[PDB]
Design a protein around this ligand. Structure first.
Ligand SMILES: NC(=O)CC[C@H](N)C(=O)O
Ligand SMILES: NC(=O)CC[C@H](N)C(=O)O
Lengths: 187, 267, 267, 267, 187, 267
């Protein structure tokens, strides 16, 4: 019934993800220590600064604990970067999604935007907010491409792993977290 | 379509910035340390001795090309063309900063005309609501920059927090005169009470100089920490910035903060 | 469907009232004279001697059933249940009147909660904008009621007119602090500058006692005239009210005003 | 056993009194009308002209033997033996009333020594918390007794309500100095924030003179109405008291309040 | 499941009764108009001034509506007086409980008290608060005597009607309202 | 079981500390001298020239590992994370010290949230009662630290002693307003009068610099002596500290104090 879903509370919009978890009818846990990973059935890597998030995960055993964990994951911006196997110009981190992603494909904040997104299998009018968002350059075998914007894909799903370039937590539409919890963690 | 410049984007750029520390930076090599230490953004700047202006676009571009984290620059109060020039360079945030010598001692910038979000300083709910009304997309405490004394940051944070908490439970009949008393836009106060929280992110800024009073800001209700140049005034700026990041993110692991303070040892 | 209570309806009830005079009334037989003299509405009331309250609902109903023109009643400042009772009776307008002894010396009524439009007094753009923000759907000058001295009505009308004319051509950069200086809601001032005129109808009220200073109010920029009980203090209230209507509607036919003044001859 | 005198009993005597009106009374025949009109209790009293004392025990016994509803009498501020004599007569409540000439201009009564509950006047959270600390088991607004002007009752009620609402959401770190600022016992403020409401019942008292501003007090947050002798200054005190009861219990039936006001017609 | 229980909100401790209803797991409705009686499945006559309560009920059709209503009722102090068929020195009101009750049997407020009460069928340590409380002088046929204090009975139950002389709403113990809702209204 | 953190334990840690002197310390070898001189505890610290913070945890651990007597460290006023970090290190006492630059110029620490006892400075019964209400488990005189002038310590000790002696015999009717006059929690004053003494231990601190004015503090009513620079600014700290201990324990053996003063001979 009521499932406990964790949000990596190292840095970023953790309150918004916890609120969206509570909107889906579940309990949210802001995880800051590795031990809390043993108390949740799902993990959301929230939006923030991928550099800061990497630096924080590398210092408390989070990288080794999450590289070896069998927990399903939902990465937004930065979280998608952290989940990718390869990063253009840098190196892959958690190596969970067989994709190659480039950081800051659009302009800087003076070029961030909002739009409507038709995500395959969720909804046809998701309110997507792109804030210096990355884009997925290449996909591997077994990676479903859920949503693209101008031939540049931004939303993918590989089995029990879900990655998006936009940040749905900043909106009042909680359908993405609902889909993640009810069709990935509940499977 | 492409709703660029919408207020939600402006303030989301800072709302998904909370939990981290923005340390200021003078040159590219300090920005490298700031990025590799866990900073969420850098404050590009050049420098009671004269009149402070905008940091030369050359040094801002030098800081910009050195890091992948957002870089923000400071503009004079009410300086239209300064903020416009910083906007043309692609700077992620402009700080309508009272630290620099103002340019308009009466009227602040017309921040809602720009497509780049702004961050402004505040000392009470009045100044915060006025800055929001002028179009600011982020708030920080005025504090006492360049002193390492946290007194003013604590005072401003506690004042604005107590005032917004009062407004969240204040009678609807009394709000108008309240807005008249603190000199604030009335619709903004109504929106504050409706949302139940401050409509924008408020960071700490000023006397932050140790990991202790950096975690104290997060304990007090701040969403993040603006750190000045004191990081590069220590014996090891790298370890200092790293410890500030650690104490900002884990502001309640007191043994961790104690170890980080034991490691550091400068003024 | 039935969009009842929209602000446009509230303020249109008064916008299609300008050009005429609303004289107050005590009993039904005075309301007969007011209607048959050309008044656009009547102010039902009952009476430095005590505390003034709402006029008894019996007398308000007596005035209501006697005329087909709109009838408006006075409520105490900030008196919630008084305005609610006047609303339940179907009164077309409630005057949040400072003439009656106030009920809340600090906070005015929450006028946007009601479905009946309100009219409030003002002496400058600050008070007018504050009343509009609280939800007022009509404005009048405070003046000096019960004195027949037009000085205060002229002063308030000229003050608010000069301030709104200043705001219509005021720089966008300077509006915010302006709202801080006069203690006014900022969005309302922006709407004033956008529309180019005052967002609601402003009438004259107070020292009006002769046709001359009744036409003077329209010459000064007022949209209408609120006349007190002085009409029924003359030798012939019928001819007096008729002359006031004529001078209000044709405020620039000076020979007509002279003839009407020659006809009248009381204090 | 028989836990007589517990604070819960003292304040429950008034907590299960809210929703009704207590009108004061001079003689037995007025108490008959007060009881048969729906009053929840009567204030037995005898009378800028001299020095006011306790109402003679004979008149208090005359009022007591005439009604079955609780009767409360007034005692001078800090008058120990006066309150003790009123307690010996079995009076249900003693009003440490500032209306009577005080007896101790510095120190209030030691209310927690008595086994009879007390009611005291207050104008802000400071005075209310001080009275509670001294042992008061009920609170009312000081208002402006004998004037029929509701301004002071509204002011005091709104002040204490806004202050307690601020305290319910005030930071735990800031409460102590808050108690130092308003001059209030600190533990009482902590108990206020813990319970989330005022630990005792606060009634309205003073300028109540019509059904409108009697229902306005309940609309503002008051738990009941203290009505003075104005009831027996009208043409029909019976209908007046009945209308006050009706407007106090149904403070939001505005057509009912309008009908009751139409029935009445005195000063 | 969630039942709507009404409290006569004419005068008295209505907030406490609504709170105790909410503590029992049900919704409370403060009834001030007769029409609301058609929306509740149970009624609580709260503690207050019986004179004021009678005067308020006699003026809005509440007396005729409640004398003819088939709704179960729970009367505390004053409410017990209103529910009684006979009142010493006065006349009975709602005529729901076949009992004779005397008002203000103890002293005035300077003689009000608290005690522990062993109510037959509820609990053995109910925290009873008597504030100028009445006492039931005589019982009729079919009236169960649940609790007595000093040979003076104070708590009775006749079928779907429950009467108490004390006021349990002033305490944190909500077992009396719970018993009323779960064993009288739910029957 | 294990009733850890009860107020009785907090204040007993200091109640079984009276009769001895706590001298502050910078490094391990000075703590060695302090222990070998008869000190009951040491005050670990690091240093009108800047902003004073917490003493680096490294130096506090260096002082901790060098002695078996309790070690106490200083935290900034209202600094939550500083006191929490000192608590995590196992420090026996935290001094919410006004000597260090404060962190919250308005609100003191929430001392009753901690499980480590606190010591605070006071100058009158008001400040003492406020600190106790905030949760302090020990009191000292503010004095004039770093001056060697005993005037302020004498003044504060005598003031608080005279005020508590007045309260011990003060009328029950007058206590409440008394608490209002000195700005103190009322229940704490009632507890003071009930116990007959100050509910916690009050030490001397500030101008102590010779054995004479160290024994004078015990003669005046102090329970112990906090010594600052009086020992670590002289030519011979070992003999100086030994003489201070002797004069503190035998504060009425005047020939002994004279001999100890003859031995010493510096500023
Ligand atoms: N998540 C964001 O704020 C986007 C920018 C960030 N530096 C990143 O690419 O990870
Ligand atoms: N309910 C009470 O407050 C008890 C006293 C009241 N007059 C009565 O007997 O009904």
């Amino acid at each position: 019934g009521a499932m406990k879903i964790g949000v990596l509370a190292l840095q970023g919009a953790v309150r918004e993800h916890i609120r969206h978890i509570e909107l889906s009818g579940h309990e949210g846990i802001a995880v800051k220590k590795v031990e809390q990973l043993e108390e949740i059935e799902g993990l959301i890597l929230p939006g923030g600064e991928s550099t800061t998030l990497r630096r924080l995960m590398n210092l408390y055993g989070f990288k080794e604990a999450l590289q070896n964990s069998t927990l399903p994951m939902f990465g937004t911006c930065a979280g998608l970067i952290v989940l990718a196997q390869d990063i253009v110009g840098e190196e892959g981190y958690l190596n969970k999604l067989n994709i190659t992603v480039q950081r800051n494909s659009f302009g800087r904040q003076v070029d961030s935007f909002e739009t409507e997104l038709d995500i395959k299998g969720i909804a046809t009018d998701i309110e997507g907010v792109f804030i210096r968002a990355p884009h997925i350059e290449k996909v591997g075998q077994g990676v479903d491409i859920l949503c693209k914007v101008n031939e540049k894909i931004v939303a993918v799903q590989q089995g029990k792993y879900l990655g998006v370039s936009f940040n749905p937590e900043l909106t009042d539409d909680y359908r993405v977290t609902d889909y993640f919890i009810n069709h990935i963690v509940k499977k | 379509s492409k709703i660029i410049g919408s207020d939600r984007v402006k303030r989301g750029m800072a709302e998904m910035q909370k939990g981290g520390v923005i340390m200021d930076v003078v040159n590219a090599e300090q920005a490298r340390i700031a990025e590799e230490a866990g900073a969420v953004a850098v404050m590009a700047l050049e420098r009671a001795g004269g009149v402070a202006r905008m940091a030369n676009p050359k040094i801002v571009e030098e800081v910009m090309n050195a890091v992948s984290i957002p870089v923000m620059a400071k503009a004079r109060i009410g300086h239209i063309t300064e903020a416009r020039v910083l906007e043309a360079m692609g700077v992620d945030y402009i700080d309508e900063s009272e630290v620099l010598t103002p340019a308009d001692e009466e009227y602040h910038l017309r921040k809602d005309q720009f497509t780049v979000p702004f961050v402004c300083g505040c000392r009470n709910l009045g100044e915060a609501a006025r800055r929001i009304g002028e179009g600011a997309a982020m708030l920080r405490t005025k504090g006492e920059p360049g002193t390492g004394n946290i007194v003013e940051a604590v005072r401003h944070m506690r004042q604005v927090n107590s005032e917004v908490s009062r407004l969240t439970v204040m009678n609807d009949d009394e709000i108008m005169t309240f807005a008249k008393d603190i000199g604030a836009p009335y619709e903004i106060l109504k929106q504050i009470k409706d949302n139940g929280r401050l409509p924008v992110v408020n960071f700490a800024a000023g006397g932050v100089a140790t990991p202790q009073d950096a975690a104290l800001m997060m304990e007090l209700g701040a969403d993040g920490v603006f750190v000045g140049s004191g990081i590069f005034k220590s014996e090891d700026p790298e370890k200092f910035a790293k410890a500030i990041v650690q104490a900002t993110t884990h502001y309640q692991d007191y043994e961790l903060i104690g170890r980080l303070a034991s490691e550091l040892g400068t003024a």
